[model samples]
Structures are given as C-alpha cells and as structure tokens.
Target: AGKDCITIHSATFAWSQESPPCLHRINLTVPQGCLLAVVGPVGAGKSSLLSALLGELSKVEGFVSIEGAVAYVPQEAWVQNTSVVENVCFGQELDPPWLERVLEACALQPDVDSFPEGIHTSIGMNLSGGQKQRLSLARAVYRKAAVYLLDDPLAALDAHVGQHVFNQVIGPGGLLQGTTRILVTAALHILPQADWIIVLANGAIAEMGSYQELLQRKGALVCLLDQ
Candidate 1:
C-alpha cells in the first residue's frame, strides 16, 4: 500500500524557464491526517509552496511527493456553468445525506435554500464571490480525497462565515477530521489550531513549528503576529 503522507527534501523549484528566484532547500514532512498551515507576508511564496506540492511549479531539483489522492482548492474559486448541486457533484455520484452534510459543513445550505429553486438553481451571475468560494470548497469536501491542498479559501468569506466554515469543515472535530490538510492562510487567529505551521520567507521555509514553538523562538512569525 502507498503512504498517505507528504515529503519533500532538498527541493529547489525555482519555476519556469526564466528561473525566477523561488524555493530553495525546502524540506518538509507531513504525516497523514495532520493539518499544516502555511503563512507569510505578501510575496512570500506561500501559494507557490502549495503549487509546488501539486507539481505545477517546475521541480528543478529534489523530490516532492504527496503519496495519496489529492484534492486542491486554489485561491480563486472555479465555478461550473450548471446547477448548484451539479457544480458540487462535478459529475460524480454521492449519497444525498452526504451531499446535504457537505453543503451544511460548507455553510451553503442556507444560501442554497435562498435560491429560486434551491439546490437546483443554476449559477450564472447569481452566486456572490463568497458563495462561489464555498461552492468550490463543497466540491473538494465531496471528493473526500486523502490529502487536501487549500490556498487561503477563507479570504473570500466574512468573519463569522469563515469561522463557521473552519469549525464545521477544517477544525479537528470537523467533517475532514481524519484527512490530511495543507492550507495556506493569512488569518492568524486559526494558526493556533494548526498541527504545524511554516512561514515562507524569501521563497523558503524561514520558520516552522507549532504556534507556541514559533512564539518562543521570537522569530519572523512573532513579528508578524505583532501586526
């Protein structure tokens, strides 16, 4: 059987033929079912780190392996030209109860009910940006893949909605409790909940550890939390 963890060692994905100055000597290991939160200031290569795991960036050197089925929710949400439920199912069959659960976990149940035909409503220009973000999240949740690579999906949502989604979907006792999650987030309030955290700086892992560990180190993250 294949492993479900993630491992990267001596990886230097500078990306593209232009060879932009990107990640260098990046090494990390995320065990199965654990949550890893990636955070950093702007232009810190946080999104690139997730993209590197997906092999979107050119792996100039070293090994980047995510040993399991992977589901990725990018920073920008992609919506289908179809009904709400259809966009969620993405042409795959799922039990109705499970679909209902996913919708609720994503904070979409109430929004769907407000639609003209509820779950049957076809998304055109109707869904708001936040709704589309949750729609994208709902599909990823339905996929139930072994590993999820999320790119700051909460930014589009309001404070309470983001908190609700985190509680119902991403938190320890949430729906994806036993699934490995690698999330890139700017919101520091949830950093304390992460099993591990890495700060990207100058295109590499400048700092990494649990919240308290980073705090004690008095490094870049602590300076960031100062903001």
Candidate 2:
C-alpha cells in the first residue's frame, strides 16, 4: 500500500463494553487525497467505524491498515477552558501566518473579533456551539496531518458557517486539499461532492459508490435522501 492510502478488510469492531461487534465484515479502501463520505442512519455503526480506525474500539475480526499520520475530530467538539489562540494552538509552537490561515479557513475570524481580547480572549461558558466546532476544526487544520477522520465536524454550525468552513477548509482545493479525509456526515446535499460514499445500515455496508452511481440505484442512500 502507498503511504497515503487506507485499506480495511473484513473488519468487525465494537465498543469496549459491547459483546458483539457493531461493524460487520466491512471492507473499504481510501486513497490519499480522497474525500470519502460515510453516511448512515442512527445505530448504523457510523461512529463505531470511525472509532475502529482511531483504535478506540475492540477489533473482533479482520484488520485495518493506514499509511500516514492521523488527526481526528469527534462528533462532540472538545474545547479548552483557555484563550481562543491557546485552544487552537493546542501546545504547538505558534506560527502567526498559519494561525491566521487556519482561523480563516475555520470561519472563526469573525467570532474572534467579537471576543474581548480577540484570539487571546479566554473561552468558557461564553462560547457558542458553532464557535466551539469551528475551533475544533481549526485545531485539526493547524496540525496538517496526513489523514483526517472527522465525525460530522459541521453538525453544530448553522448553514452559513458550515458552508463557509466546508468551502474553505474541506472542499476541493481547500486547506486540506492533499490530505486524506474520511468524513462521517448526514448532509446529503454534499454527497455528490465526495469522491466516494459508503452507506451503512444495521451495522453493514448497504451500498458504496460515487454519489451519482448510488443515486441511480435508489438504494439506502436514495432512501435517506428522500426522507
């Protein structure tokens, strides 16, 4: 395998406490720089799949292999009880130009300006859900890892903010353009934008293909779209 690809074969994984694996016999391949979208209904094991990649789940069968550094952003964004700049910096040496670019790509510049001390403003109960999500994205973007496993990173943002971040940070020609991305998302509208799609149902792969291919099947993905 190349240094930028991820390959999973017949993998079954589950949470530590769960006796049975929630992900069953899953096989997938994601090449470098590919934006692969994983979509599924509730309890379809979407998060479990990501957890397995992160080594947070118990592997019950098969194996997963990756070829590069990784960075993950979970469903619920975590924030530091410190200043905005410190939160994004996350202990890394600060580079003003990169910090500025990250903040811009994450759509956080406006929010930073509203803060009393700008990027240095302390963050606590005052931060909104959208701001926290964007900050999480900024942290991930600033790291510039080889692969990104994002668990619905835009779920908390309103439509406009989410769109901005998607365009500037995750879209084609975006900040992470050359990086591999596996994004767990429910936004069907962006399905076609993905290089490939994996649709899960009942802990299994219900379908997989390019958006247009899957749409032509009118299968699980179409069903979700119709709903």
Candidate 3:
C-alpha cells in the first residue's frame, strides 16, 4: 500500500540482445493518480517505454515494478470481430451507470447509435483509423485498470475531436481524474498539463520537468519545440 503506482529505476531493455538496448538507464516513478507524458522524436523509445511497462521487452538490468493492473491503448486500434459494446466492455461485467459514461467520454455514442444493430452489431463499415482508435480508447476506459498506458491515442483523430476526447476523458478533472496514466504522445498541445513530462531521446531520458519548468530551464524539451 505504501508503494508508488509504477516505478522504473536505472532500467534497461531491448527487443533482442543483439540490436543494443532500446531503452537505457530509464528511471521513472508515478505516484497513484498522477499523470506522466512521455514525448520524444519517433523511434526514440516513446513507444518502447510503454512496451517495457507491458513486459514485452527483454530486461537487461535494474528494477521495474507496477503496483496495479494496467490497461493499454496502443497506437494501432487492433480489435476483434465483435460488437461495439462487446469490444468496449471487453467481456467484463457492465454497470449501466459506468457504461454510458465511457461511451460518451470516448465520443462513441453516435457511432453506436448509427450502427445497424446498435450495441451488438459487428463493425460492418470500413471504419477509418480515427474510429478504430476511439474504440480502442473506449475499451481501456471501461476496464477500470489502476494504470493506463496510452500510446499516441490522439494520433488518429481530427483536430477538434482530439481536443474533445482529451477534455472529457484524459485531461484535468476528466473521467480519469484519480487514475494514474502514462501517455506517450507527440502532440504537445495536450501534454503541457501532465504532472511531469519526460523527454526521451535515442533510448534515454533526456530530461524531466513540468511544462513550465522545462520552458524556464530551456531543456531538451524546449529544444524539441523550436523546430
């Protein structure tokens, strides 16, 4: 009970031992209910960090720990050939109270309403990447996991919709207000409010600070935005 929600201390990891470690000396901690934004250039361990947390990468050394169950919303919204509600509920018991909230929070009510058989119909139309991503996000939100790993969840959305979902689901005072979240996002617009921002560069933590703090210090985070 005394432990933080997630911890990584001087950790190193790789997909295979031969290609060198993809993440190195990565020290991190997220107290229960805090938000952490992992931002970096592509192929710079942004997605790798989340994979490490999910326990896919081979650990080379150091400690890695998670105190509670995790729900992952990977970049690609890989899904099953099931109904929308089935996919969202993920075979878990449904509480109508909570169910409706997740649907609206993920902005999925309209899609469900328009579906041929409503909640139970399989996805028939050729949905775009944006729709698929939202469905994935909805599944994670319904799970009630202690920690959520969001890998560029907004990458597939249009600009306005991205802003809406962030406000209703992941932002300050949002549905996940008291939930711990580690979001890997390239969109700086939403991450500035994260409790702390991590700048990953070439498989290392280049810096860590609040958005305002990073600006004042003009760290790598600032350097990245200049371009």
Q: Estimate each model's TM-score.
A: 0.95, 0.95, 0.95
Tell me the spans in candidate 3 whose CA falls farther than 4 Å from its real position.
1-3
lDDT of each: 0.87, 0.87, 0.86
User: RMSD, each candidate, Å?
Assistant: 2.1, 1.7, 1.7
Q: How far is candidate 1 from the true structure (C-alpha RMSD, Å)?
A: 2.1
How far out, in Å, is residue 14 in model 3? 0.9
lDDT by residue for model 1 over 93-157, one digit each (tens)?
Answer: 95799999999999999999899888889886477888999999999899888899999998979
lDDT of 2 by residue, 29-88 (tens): 788888889998988988888888988888888988987889888788879899998888
lDDT of 3 by residue, 190-220 (tens): 7677988889889999989888998898878
The TM-score of candidate 3 is: 0.95
lDDT of 2 at 15: 68
Could you tell me how far off, in angstroms, the CA of residue 34 lies in candidate 3 after the best superposition? 1.0
User: Which residue pairs of candidate 2 clash?
Assistant: none
